[PDB]
């Protein structure tokens, strides 16, 4: 089975010539015969609902059958890498999602994995507190211990020269990528820090911890001084994700709530995303659509939201049979992957026009 994005790109390129934008785009009928009229999400910018990937594609699982903590796409979408509890990276093809290669990367569960803004480096942390450097060809070039306890998430700077790490020691540490030398140590979280995010352009660090008194803190990486404390959630903020527009902070937490904040004005909340029956654990902004994002849950629910809409624009309550750890969007934005605690990773694509959505993830047959 295959999800080949090339026909969509070719159709978009042809339509790109004579259509000014989607207002000139000819409508696709909800019929199975209009297969070659589909375009990637970049084509339908006025309708983000196309990228609500509630169509199941493939369940990708390892032979070890162990929980999957982080899934990431190769920056050009050629491959997908999963970080598992066995400290291994499994690579899956971006078109025919088959197993390609496996390697014992870390000695402890892979909790963090991120690619540099330039498509040259993949930084991965693990449960033992080490940080590893990776080449596009999955070659390890450097290894050092950043924290004495588990590192949860790492984020890169726009120029990829500096990166931040969050650990269970309650400290966020800024590092120099070339030197592997820590420059600042950020303190103020009383409990384990579970998520860290670097501002897309500006020099800002947003962090989320288990400390109820200091749930979210904003940092100044160059000076090392905390800028603000955000009393967003009352229970274990799990995710902090700044949108690439540099204005929105997206926070998932154990309090069954996902929240959106304007980092310029943190007095109030822009939006609260209710609809998770259980704890909200994962989240991922859409690469193409600004306001669209997908969130995961501890019961296995995988929901879709858009900024400005009260209720979910879609979702699958039984997407996984376990807590969803990581959500990764394909660079083109037409395939969504989900790493869950149920020892499996699943690929979700856009629903083909003319489908009677009576499958187990949408309805009952």
């Amino acid at each position: 089975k295959t999800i080949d994005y090339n026909p969509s790109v070719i159709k978009y390129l042809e339509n790109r010539i004579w259509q000014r934008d989607q207002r000139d785009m000819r409508a696709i009928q909800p019929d199975a015969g209009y297969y070659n009229d589909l375009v990637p999400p970049i084509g339908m910018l006025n309708n983000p609902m196309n990228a609500v990937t509630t169509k199941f594609v493939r369940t990708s699982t390892n032979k070890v059958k162990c929980p999957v903590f982080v899934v990431r796409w190769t920056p050009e979408g050629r491959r997908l890498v999963t970080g598992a509890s066995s400290g291994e990276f499994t690579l899956w093809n971006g078109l025919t999602f088959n197993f390609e290669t496996i390697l014992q990367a870390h000695d402890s569960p892979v909790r963090a994995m991120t690619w540099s803004h330039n498509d040259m480096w993949m930084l991965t942390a693990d449960h033992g507190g080490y940080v590893k450097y990776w080449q596009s060809n999955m070659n390890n070039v450097k290894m050092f211990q950043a924290h004495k306890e588990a590192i949860r998430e790492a984020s890169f700077s726009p120029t990829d020269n500096k990166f931040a790490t969050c650990s269970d020691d309650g400290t966020v540490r800024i590092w120099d990528f070339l030197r592997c030398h820590e420059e600042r140590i950020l303190r103020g979280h009383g409990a384990d820090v579970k998520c860290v995010d670097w501002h897309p352009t500006k020099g800002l660090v947003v962090s989320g911890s288990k400390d109820s008194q200091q749930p979210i803190k904003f940092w100044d990486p160059k000076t090392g001084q905390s800028l603000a404390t955000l009393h967003a959630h009352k229970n274990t903020v799990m995710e902090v994700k700044l949108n690439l527009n540099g204005n929105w902070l997206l926070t998932a937490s154990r309090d069954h709530l996902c929240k959106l904040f304007d980092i310029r004005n943190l007095k109030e909340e822009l939006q609260v995303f209710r609809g998770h029956k259980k704890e909200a654990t994962a989240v991922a902004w859409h690469p193409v659509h600004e306001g669209l994002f997908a969130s995961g849950g501890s019961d296995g629910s995988l929901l879709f939201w858009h900024v400005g809409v009260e209720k979910e624009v879609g979702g699958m309550e039984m997407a996984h049979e376990g807590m969803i750890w990581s959500l990764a969007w394909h660079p083109l934005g037409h395939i969504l992957c989900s790493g869950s605690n149920d020892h499996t990773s699943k690929f979700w694509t856009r629903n083909r026009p003319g489908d009677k959505m009576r499958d187990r993830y949408n309805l009952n047959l």
Partner: protein
């Protein structure tokens, strides 16, 4: 590094159309707009019907929506234009200036109105109340700006957040003001819970309508009427006029009529509604159509004209009852027409179809036998989306010009789309077709007369003698008497009604009947200039004396013009007015320029002063009633001589003034016409001609000869003619051997008998021949060794099978089923000799193969003495849905020469396919590199060597998501990704290694890429979806590029149009520079010329001065428009369209601006004119 942008060809596409009172409230005009271009047309009932251009304006910003309104006691309709992001400009025509006057510009570009969404996807949509009580502009998709109008003409505007409006109006598909309401009622068609086709099984009835009553005074907007269960595929709404009222909502598969009181009425236009809509829809009988992308307008009440996708025209009838309640729909299929983007109803019976995809058509409808029939009355030329452009050598050039050292080139453009797809041949300059050549040294001036329609004599003037050539079946020197051949001649022409001939000499004036001479009265300073128009003939001496001669029945009478000599007359002009613009049947006027710089126009029979300009030579922008001008010509052009034009020669500058009406003084005013014509025995430079190949116009002689043509369309055309160098004298020539041709002297004393080429049309901004293809033109490639054009074309066929992974299932549906369109591709061969397609030279692609790229590539060959061989390469992709692995083919085609088939000369050229094999992935891009074929197959870029009939791979490299465009120069390949920007590659022949030198790390959705060639600097010109031009440089020593791994943005420019094709030509300083040419997707052609640093700095100070101290159309900011992505920038590209405003300024205003910017007008003019001169190709 530094460069200047110049627009070679203006955009032709049209996107908005309306029929409003542009000039006055006594006549309504067709106001159309495209991308930064606004046109105002008139409807001419005598020509047959033809659209006459009345005005044209350019903006520093693309129009996003256009509308009109009559505000309060106004003499004409105001125009409401919206520009990207949030700008609303209210522009009104200025009768006293013949220009656009800005009434107000409203800015709504605040971060708080954007709600954190940096990427704007909602164009500002301006709507007007039918009653003219307010105007609404939907801003960012969530803010509704209400601009009230007083019933000083405007009221303070307020912004309504549609999200906090009773309900939550999200998305918003369309919004229209409704008829028949006491207060402005705006009907918003929106989608609170958006869905898309594909997720309909879980969400079907998502669209809704809400009618909000806008209270202007109290700023309250309550909801008065609402529906919630409309079909998801609603696309647009149309307010039905007052007698019926309500709203007609267009859905993709259905048509709905909705009103406040009656229950909703809707019908299903096809069987596709079943299972995708729960709305109650009747089955409309006999109709299988789709209303997804359709333009509609109300020709009258209860009847609608709808233009569908595919161009089909339908007449929709609202069948009602005695209570005006719609109960049924009647659909009548009229004749098909052009793919339109806008529609508007002119005077009843006429319907204009604005189009940016093919030529815009003006239609006429008549009731047949209810039903209507449509006929085409006019057609506005539109070189549509320029998907690709090919440069090639014209097939026919004169043997006289064969040895010219500047190459002769033409541009072939893949324009239009679908049924309107075509090939456009574009040439900037006119190339004469020389019949025979005469070498006649010593003749500096010519005149051609009509002997008792055909020209019978050719009068040539020497320094001390005169040559008379009698023209007929043979041209022989006339040595017989009758003509004054013993001295030079000042002027020779036809007097009366082409029955007599008048010949002017410095000694006197004589009347001539053919070879016979009637009488010769001496005239006494020697005569230096004479003007002849009707019996009235005026004579000017060397000292400014003016003498007038009248043809009194026939004999030339003497009449002394009463003129007080305050200042010496330096030049004269006569003009016959046939169109009654010179109001205060034929009437006669004399244009006169004095030494003190005052232009005076007199009524010729009585010599009464009617017009006066206080400071004429300075070149004022607008001439109103009350140095060293060398020549003036006042002529009426257009249909039935409708457009009076004034051409002025002064101090190496050309002044063109377009006469426009403005109310015992002459009720006419002149407006300067922008142009780029450089002027850097009294011989007249301006030669008026009628009927050269059917065209009326004026020829301008000098260093830069030009053709000034104005047809019945009313648009001024200026075509250069420099293939033969400067032209000294010019004359029309109608002969048996030279039918409707012309006649001119080259600067070498040679005389050309030449005619205009027939295959081109000169009624366009560029001489163009548009070849209809009836299918979509994708790529065009020119072959040099065969001198032919290869074109990849696709046509739409109904889809009947669905590939599955390989099996195909036949689409079995109902009879009312709309089959999807399937494209079938073919490669055509076009002969430039006769632009018809070559028979039996057509290659058909496979069933689902799509031509993603087709290029002409030079590859190594041993048979050719040179290294390269120059084939044509094509790359294809089998589009069979996302569920099937896409793979492609490489097609290497050679055009050979064979014996022509009898009776078919074009059959000499035929394809020879050398390579056609299946690739290991989709072939998405192609180019050549040192004789090696470079192909982007899948997510890798390969390099092949063509030997025998098999491609051997040499080197490959991994690349980005999808490489669509790819160009190379000197083993440096520049590859562009669809959304991950550009990458620079290097090929080393010795090691056979393909390596990545640098790439742009930041994401960018690239349209096409080229190179910017300087003396030693190599740039990378990039075009993006945001309509911007970026120049990237490889600067390893720069700090921003960490190790030479980041391409640095060094020049930035926002061209208001998308660019998909590029080409480069050498300069016509400028030692090793190449102009980067590009054709936009809006039908325009632009260039980007590299420039020196000091020249750039001086012209940048000039540009800043022009931006600051000069008012602009619609109040837009030229600097803000050219800023990148505003609707980290490096402003290193200048705006030639803005820099051209210095040429349009008067000599005075130029002097003060040069004083302000601390330089001199002569230096600024030299720089600007050098930029103009080096780019005079095609």
């Amino acid at each position: 590094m530094y460069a200047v942008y110049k627009q070679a060809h203006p955009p032709t596409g049209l996107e908005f159309s309306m029929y409003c009172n542009f000039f006055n409230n006594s006549e309504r005009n067709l106001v159309v707009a495209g991308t930064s271009q606004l046109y105002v047309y008139r409807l001419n009932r005598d020509a047959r019907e033809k659209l006459e251009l009345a005005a044209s304006f350019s903006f520093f910003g693309n129009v996003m929506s256009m509308a009109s309104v009559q505000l309060a006691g106004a003499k004409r309709d105001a125009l409401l234009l919206s520009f990207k992001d949030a700008k609303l400009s209210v522009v009104e025509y200025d009768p006293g200036t013949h220009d656009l006057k800005t009434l107000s510009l409203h800015y709504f570009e605040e971060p708080e109105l954007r709600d954190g969404f940096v990427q704007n996807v909602h164009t500002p949509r301006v709507r007007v109340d039918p009653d003219g009580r307010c105007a609404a502009m939907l801003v960012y998709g969530t803010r509704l700006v209400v601009l009230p109008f007083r019933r000083s003409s405007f009221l303070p505007s307020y912004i309504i957040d549609v999200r906090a409006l009773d309900e939550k109006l999200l998305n918003i598909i369309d919004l229209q003001f409704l008829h028949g309401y006491y207060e402005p009622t705006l009907l918003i068609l929106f989608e609170p819970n958006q869905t898309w086709p594909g997720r309909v099984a879980v969400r079907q009835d998502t669209c809704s309508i809400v009618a909000i009553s806008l209270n202007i005074t109290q700023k309250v907007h309550p909801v008065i009427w609402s529906l919630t269960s409309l079909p998801f595929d609603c696309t647009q709404a149309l307010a039905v006029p007052k007698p019926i009222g309500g709203v007609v909502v267009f859905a993709v598969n259905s048509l709905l009529y909705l009103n406040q009181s009656v229950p909703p009425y809707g019908v299903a236009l096809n069987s596709l509604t079943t299972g995708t809509t729960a709305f109650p829809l009747r089955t409309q009988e006999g109709v299988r159509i789709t209303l997804d992308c359709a333009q509609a307008t109300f020709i009258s009440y209860d009847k609608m004209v709808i233009s569908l996708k595919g161009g089909e025209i339908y007449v929709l009838t609202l069948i009602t009852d005695g209570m005006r309640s719609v109960r049924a729909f009647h659909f009548d299929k009229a004749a098909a027409s052009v793919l339109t983007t806008s529609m508007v109803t002119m005077e009843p019976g006429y319907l204009f179809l604005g189009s940016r995809l093919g030529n815009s058509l003006l239609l006429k409808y008549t009731e047949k036998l209810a039903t209507y029939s449509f006929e085409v009355c006019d057609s506005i030329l539109n070189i549509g989306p320029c998907a690709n452009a090919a440069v090639g050598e014209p097939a026919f050039l004169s043997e006289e010009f064969q040895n010219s050292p500047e190459p002769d080139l033409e541009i072939v453009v893949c324009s239009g789309h679908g049924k309107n797809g075509a090939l456009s041949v574009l040439q900037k300059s006119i190339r004469p077709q020389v019949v025979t050549t005469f070498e006649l040294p010593g003749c500096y001036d010519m005149w051609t007369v009509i002997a008792p329609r055909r020209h019978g004599f050719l009068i040539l003037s020497r320094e001390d003698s005169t040559m008379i050539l009698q023209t007929g079946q043979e041209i022989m020197e006339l040595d017989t008497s009758g003509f004054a051949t013993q001295g030079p001649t000042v002027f020779a022409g036809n007097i009366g009604d082409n029955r007599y001939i008048v010949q002017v000499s410095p000694l006197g004036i004589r009347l001539l009947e053919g070879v016979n001479q009637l009488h010769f009265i001496p005239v006494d300073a020697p005569i230096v200039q004479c003007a002849v128009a009707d019996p009235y003939v005026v004579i000017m001496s060397a000292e400014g004396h003016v003498t007038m001669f009248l043809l009194k029945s026939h004999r030339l009478a003497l009449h002394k013009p009463p003129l007080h000599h305050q200042s010496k007359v330096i030049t004269l002009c006569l003009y016959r007015d046939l169109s009654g613009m010179f109001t205060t049947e034929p009437t006669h006027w004399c244009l006169l320029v004095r030494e003190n710089g005052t232009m005076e126009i007199y009524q010729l029979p009585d010599w009464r002063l009617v017009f006066l300009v206080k400071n004429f030579p300075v070149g004022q922008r607008v001439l109103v009633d009350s140095p060293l001008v060398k020549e003036v010509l006042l002529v009426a052009l257009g249909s039935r001589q409708s457009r009076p034009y004034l051409l002025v020669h002064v101090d190496q500058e050309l002044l063109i003034y377009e006469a426009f009406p403005h109310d015992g003084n002459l009720k006419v005013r002149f407006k300067k016409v922008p142009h780029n014509i450089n002027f850097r025995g009294r011989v007249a430079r301006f030669r008026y001609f009628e009927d050269i190949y059917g065209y009326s116009g004026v020829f301008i002689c000098g260093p830069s000869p030009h053709w000034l043509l104005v047809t019945g369309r009313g648009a001024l055309r200026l075509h250069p003619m420099a293939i033969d160098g400067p032209v000294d004298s010019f004359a029309p020539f109608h002969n048996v051997n030279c039918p409707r041709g012309f006649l001119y002297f080259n600067r070498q004393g040679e005389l050309r008998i030449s005619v205009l080429p027939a295959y081109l049309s000169y009624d366009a901004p560029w001489p163009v021949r548009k070849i209809p293809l009836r299918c979509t033109a994708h790529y065009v490639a020119y072959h040099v060794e065969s001198k032919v054009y290869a074109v990849a074309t696709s046509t739409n066929t109904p889809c009947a099978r669905i590939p599955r992974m390989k099996e195909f299932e036949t689409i079995e549906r109902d009879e009312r089923y709309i089959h999807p369109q399937q494209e079938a591709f073919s490669i055509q061969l076009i002969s430039p000799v006769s632009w018809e397609a070559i028979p039996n030279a057509r290659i058909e692609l496979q069933e689902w193969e799509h031509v993603t790229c087709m290029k002409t590539v030079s590859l190594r060959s041993e048979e050719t003495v040179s290294g390269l061989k120059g084939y044509v390469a094509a790359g294809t992709c089998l589009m069979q849905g996302e569920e099937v692995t896409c793979r492609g083919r490489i097609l290497i085609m050679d055009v050979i020469e064979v014996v022509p088939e009898p009776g078919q000369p074009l059959t000499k050229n035929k394809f020879k396919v050398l390579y056609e094999k299946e690739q290991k992935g989709p072939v998405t891009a192609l180019c050549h590199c040192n004789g090696h074929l470079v192909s982007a197959i899948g997510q890798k870029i390969f390099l092949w060597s063509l030997r025998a009939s098999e491609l051997t791979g040499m080197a490959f490299i991994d690349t980005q998501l999808y490489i669509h465009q790819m160009i190379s120069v000197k083993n440096f390949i520049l590859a562009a990704d669809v959304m991950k920007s550009i990458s620079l590659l290097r090929y080393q022949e010795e090691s056979k290694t393909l390596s990545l030198v640098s790439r742009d790390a930041k994401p960018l959705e690239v349209y096409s890429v080229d190179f910017m060639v300087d003396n030693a600097q190599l740039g990378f010109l990039v075009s993006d979806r945001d309509r911007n031009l970026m120049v990237y440089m490889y600067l390893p020593e720069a700090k921003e590029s960490f190790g030479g791994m980041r391409l640095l943005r060094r020049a930035d420019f926002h061209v208001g149009a998308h660019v998909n094709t590029f080409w480069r030509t050498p300069c016509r300083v400028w030692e090793n520079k190449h102009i980067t040419w590009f054709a936009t997707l809006d039908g325009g052609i632009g260039l980007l010329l590299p420039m020196q640093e000091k020249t750039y700095r001086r012209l940048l100070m000039l540009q800043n001065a022009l931006t600051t101290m000069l008012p602009h159309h619609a109040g837009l900011n030229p600097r803000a428009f050219r800023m990148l992505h505003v609707d980290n920038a490096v402003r290193n590209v200048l705006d030639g369209e803005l820099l051209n405003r210095y040429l349009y300024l008067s000599t005075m205003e130029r002097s003060e601006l040069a004083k302000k910017i601390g330089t001199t007008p002569d230096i600024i003019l030299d720089d600007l004119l050098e930029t103009d001169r080096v780019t005079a190709h095609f």
